[model samples]
Target: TCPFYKKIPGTGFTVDAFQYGVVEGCTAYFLTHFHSDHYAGLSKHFTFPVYCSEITGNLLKNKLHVQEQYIHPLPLDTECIVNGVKVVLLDANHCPGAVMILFYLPNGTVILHTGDFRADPSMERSLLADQKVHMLYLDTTYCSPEYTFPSQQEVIRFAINTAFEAVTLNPHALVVCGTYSIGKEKVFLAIADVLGSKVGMSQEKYKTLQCLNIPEINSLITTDMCSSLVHLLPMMQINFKGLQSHLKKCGGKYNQILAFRPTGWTHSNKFTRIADVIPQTKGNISIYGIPYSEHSSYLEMKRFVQWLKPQKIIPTVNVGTWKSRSTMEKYFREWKLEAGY
Candidate 1:
């Protein structure tokens, strides 16, 4: 269902697919976020007009090296006309600079691309206030019942508290977190503020964080892992074997390493324990899985769909390992929102 950008009936405007599989002859391109997966094709050489949130635009220009002429800023909740088509940007509540694209095509049909977002209260009210959505490209990343877990705030609190407690228990230990390129800035920022010290960020993350201009967030390049009290490691580099190597690389100077991963998969019974929080001791590294997800859980997704009541429910996560289109549709049909979360 995620065909790069879709061609709406009677509409020429295109949304998403800034990279990855591009749609041919798109009048204009809309980027929901600056995540690499979402903009696989977008490179420094791109010269086409790409509309995205201001923060995302900055990321593209600074990090991805996208040309300024090709990148455009779409401020929140503003209507802008592109190729005679009306488009509005809404806060996606997934990550900084992520937006939910709402396009008002020429045929009076409203098309919404959830664009990998949580079921935000403000966004829900904004969408449900009035006007009908003809089609919805939903983010069903956590479309299974087993995916439900604690709220984001609760999870953040847990992570912050756990890290502090772990460090307190082991004074010589270092705190490391596994986060996506751009998603978990808040958690790290809070950790930095609470810990009264700066967190170490990778060179790639610092470039984007600079554009954010968050004075409260103090981060420097990860030059000395052993010296830094807290380090934000990329999610892809968080495996047990990799962490062991990282600890060894930091020399034997550090007595302990406390690592935590914030994700929804931590709640999946198949992959993790049913509890909201799971902790494990792997050698010198103490790893914990905290239930923190940017995407909506099954219950939240059901509530969103029930409230929005779109004429069509199309799954947008088609590129991942979960490629069962039939099973996805079946889950949607069988999933019932008995009561809202």
Candidate 2:
């Protein structure tokens, strides 16, 4: 079911050597998201002009400190021309700042490089592909059915509801979970949204959000809010115990605390320390797990391609095969589970 024929051991993903040639020529490259697979060879293989939404570009500034010279900030949903090629950056709905690059080349090559996407209703209306794409370099990670996830709001409901029950009824403690600050912006926004006029922003959270490229979203809760609630947890700051007082103050009252990683997620163990700190505190605080995440389920990949409706749909990064003389071409077929591109 894969788009390529063969598979790489650690990576079931694909990469195109032909495209590598394109990169070597140095036209321009767009990083849709900061996933390891999407941009693995970036610093090592790509030293050319890279375009992405401002948020993604900035994130990479800190991600690959040495590779900052390549990023060229571009606004999402805006159409721009680079190297005489018409390209548009569309919201990918996969992670914060994830975007799809619609490449309209002067040589009549109208291709779509969708850096991992989805059909989240709240994320975007549609890919707007009415049979115009020459090729859709799709993310077939979930091209096969067995994997698909529901809407983010539905997952949020589960998280909030479960945390409510655990804290109010069972644990009588505060809760926290792990999610990338940028990727899970919507989830945290929903938490504040649930509190509505009842919940105010925290200074730390506010300042952190402010550091982001989006001004409107920064209005959510802040570190000051940490003073009002009983449940506290920073997505990456696993030191929840040290912040126990903050949790009880933030959520308030005798509610139990809960925090765990979100679902459909791939996160580093950067916050494991906070996990240990939670139980060390004795004041009715507890930890809970709700795998709720904001990424596309496996099945979402297939659906993404069906929507974009590109003409050829070649492979992208992390996908490859063993059929061709070029390691590049072989990687394509093997990773995609297809004979040829």
Candidate 3:
């Protein structure tokens, strides 16, 4: 996962702690946060040392169920050498365990990799100033002129309102939603809140609500003792016979059900394969496809790039050497979206 450099063995960084292979002269460090994409590889392939902040270490150990043996604590704004890379962990405002890394290369080239980040100035003021960025790898995953991510508060409100509409339309129906597994935890909590407060749900929702208790969201709770109110709500009915085992205990029965699904690219065969995991039960379900994202808009991306004034930029989320063609590059050239007001 450390950019498969041909000289990986010579990178100088090696460890015997992780499930991943060690680097022998690997002068590089891997920067990650609490998310799965950033560290699942640690559980998958790494048996070497990795760098993270002190807080991130506890998060990985407690929240993520990963060991902290190879974790080298990186304090913010302080530059330190790990293996062969000069690494700096800058605070990223996207989520709790997020960070933006500045990796100083041997040639004096600094690469600023914003892993799942945002420039939201109000939440975290550490990102308000301008730092000269040389080589930057921005997480502009959804950067299109029209691709703005609505605030999490807004997203939660919209989801709750939509569910209300659906429930109102069919009083005797059951519902299911399909969101990217990692991306939709907020959606679940929002739904729980609504059902607990508005619909006066059962005791079970209160128990699961205990899972998302961070002090930052203290204002969100209706009462100090409202923990039990969450488990009292109805279970979120979703597709997949795989969940049938879990559903049996969670009150997953309804005459009618609505499901919201993550929309896929029209060209992907995976678009039609949602049923493979979410088994279809012929007459019991209805699916809704909605388009949404959580990355910078294209206009936002263009503006960010223009402001940074980088000489060259290369995308790294995917590679095409193994594919017949580079899909992302091909799409950028074939149907580039222009911004206009």
Candidate 4:
């Protein structure tokens, strides 16, 4: 859940809140990534200074046509001053160009804004782990005990193996992966690499991928529909009806559809065994909702908060309503107590 508003409490900067136009005291705007939810309000007409990772800056300039001067492409893991505030961008591990923002406010407040991150173990070794953070603006997307799931590598391996098994059984089986504009590229990319299959996507999406500069991604993608058995479609269009229409449009080149709805919502504690992660089938279409989340899971969040133990915690997501915010706060308190602090 994106916060209802974008202003950082005591700073003169607002993050991922371009939709509200400009705030009176804010001098710079920070964008964590190229996701629609984060960059919703930004446009070509806007005239504010925007700070983001180098890749995100390219996407904004190339995809959204924001002016070159207004877009400040900051390097990751390096400190820079913006509007008198020292800032550093760190890899968010959520999506390409996504970054966690570290802000050193004028009042000596060290704040970390995790703009939708997957808490990878490597992050624990980064400089952020050593900081005495006063405040933490967390990406509390899956901030509940019920939201635990397998590691990202495990899910990626599962997706690759699943697709391999399907293609091995039937060479004509079309493997379509559900994806967003920026996230989940690793799933399909890995599948294509392992299976030696060409990838397919809309030309528009291909252009966006160009901004990411992923090694050999362009070579893996093909324009010819028949040349590629693996296709990437928007998450919404991976349904039975959608695939059915797509199959018909392809003129029977592929007899069956093996699609993956790679998302975190599909997992549960009951998925104890690999076989338990089943797919929903309707006629010729089989959709597997892979627990391939880009956001941090409940246990990951707990580990992060317990390690950092910021003086104050702010829920960036699921804070739209009072009840939701309070519930997350309760979790924070419980986790703190459990840590014996």
Top TM-score model: 4
State how far residue 49 of model 2 sits from its true place (Å): 2.6
Tens-digit per-residue lDDT, 1-341, candidate 2 = 32342111122123222233343233455567766645655553456677777877766675555276677888766678766656678887777677877666666766666676664544335445433766666555433334444466666776566555554566334445454444665554555444442223444444445545665553444455433332235554544554465554444554545555554532222243212322233455444443354445554554444444444545553354443225434433343453222
Local accuracy by lDDT, each model: 0.73, 0.51, 0.48, 0.84
List the candidate numbers ranked by TM-score, top first: 4, 1, 2, 3
Cα-lDDT of candidate 1: 0.73
- Candidate 3, residue 87: CA error in Å? 4.0
Report the lDDT tens digits of candidate 3 across residue range 1-341. Answer: 33532121323532212334454455444544555555554552344456776656655555444566665667777778765566677866555445777666677666666666554543233432345556556564553333434455654566667667766777555444443223344554576566543222223332222333345343343332223222211224334442343335435344555555543222232243322223234455554444334444454555655555554345544443544225444434433233221
Give lDDT tens digits, candidate 4, residues 119-222: 87788888797678998889999888888777778888788888898889998889998877788888888898877887888888878888996887768887
TM-score of each: 0.86, 0.63, 0.61, 0.94
- How well does candidate 1 match the true structure in TM-score terms? 0.86
Candidate maximizing lDDT: 4
Better of 1 and 3 by TM-score: 1
Which residue ranges in model 3 land beyond 4 Å of their true spot?
Answer: 1-20, 34-37, 40-47, 53-56, 62-66, 73-86, 91-96, 104-108, 118-128, 140-154, 168-181, 197-213, 216-253, 262-284, 321-341
lDDT of 1 by residue, 1-341 (tens): 33533455555545566544445666677788877768777879887788888988888888779899888897787778877888888888887888988878777888888888988656667743568887888887777777766677777787778778777787778778887768867776666567666778667767667776555444443444445678888888777887887777766767787887776665254564333556788677778777667888777887777777677777787534555677677766654333221
| Stronger candidate by TM-score (2 vs 3) | 2
